[PDB]
């Protein structure tokens, strides 16, 4: 809680699953703005 210059305070690093990146990606869908309308469905389109 204090400055405690002899601490790491990153135990959450140890508590990270193998799917962690994509798991936060899945739950990051609510507060999203609209990806810009490039027009063509694909760069090839």
């Amino acid at each position: 809680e204090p400055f405690d210059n002899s601490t790491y305070r990153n135990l959450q690093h140890h508590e990270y699953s193998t799917y962690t990146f994509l798991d936060l990606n899945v739950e990051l869908s609510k507060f999203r703005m609209p990806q810009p309308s490039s027009g063509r469905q694909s760069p090839r389109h």
């Binding site: 210059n5 690093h13 994509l22 990606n25 389109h45």
Partner: protein, 214 residues
């Protein structure tokens, strides 16, 4: 490994079964929603990173399958897999040992840990263990290249490592339990062995500068 021309293997073939979990399709949808529509070819990088979490490596059945779902030509994802280093196209062990021997690590004798791990495991650099559990190979530096010479297991790293406790890194890994990920030495975050030479006073809070309206 060390190959850039595909040989159709009996087990790693285009016919190799390879699919995604119901939550995994959500992860891909979460992957593609970050990048704009009509430019979904950018999503090829993290989905390929996602690809080897399922099988354990990059099967060639995955590369063309992920090409068809991402509506990209097969050769484009073919290049993404072969270029990046951790994108391994050959099956690898459960513990992908990533020993660091880049100059800053070798200066602090990163050879000692490599020899120590070589002696116990018997298998040489690159090849898998006889139980295919660990895979020792020399690569470039992890990107954290300041502590004592460091190693990286799949997605779980270790730095501030000595030839004595590299023995103590694989022992419990062989047993199954996970060792402590991070600096083995007294560096909780990065602090020098002589304590900490900065950040003595408590950090300040808000209300500083406030130039005009700020």
């Amino acid at each position: 490994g060390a190959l850039f021309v595909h040989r159709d293997t009996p087990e790693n073939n285009p016919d190799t079964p390879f699919d995604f979990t119901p939550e995994n399709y959500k992860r891909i949808e979460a992957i593609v929603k970050n990048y704009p529509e009509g430019h979904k070819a950018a999503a090829v990088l993290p989905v390929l990173d996602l690809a080897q979490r399922q099988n354990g490596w990059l099967p060639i059945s995955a590369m063309n399958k992920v090409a068809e779902i991402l509506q990209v030509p097969p050769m484009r994802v073919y290049e993404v897999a072969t270029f990046y280093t951790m994108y391994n196209r050959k099956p690898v062990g459960k513990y992908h040992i990533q020993v660091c021997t880049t100059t800053p690590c070798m200066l602090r004798n990163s050879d000692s840990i490599l020899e120590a791990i070589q002696k116990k495991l018997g298998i040489k650099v690159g090849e898998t263990t006889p139980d295919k559990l660990f895979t020792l190979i020399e690569v470039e530096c992890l990107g954290a290249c300041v502590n004592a010479p460091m190693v990286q297991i799949n997605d779980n790293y270790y730095e501030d490592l000595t030839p004595k406790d590299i023995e103590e890194i694989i022992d419990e890994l062989k047993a199954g339990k996970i060792p402590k990920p991070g600096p083995r030495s007294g560096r909780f975050s990065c602090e020098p062995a002589g304590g900490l030479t900065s950040l003595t006073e408590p950090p300040k809070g808000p209300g500083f500068g406030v130039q005009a309206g700020l």
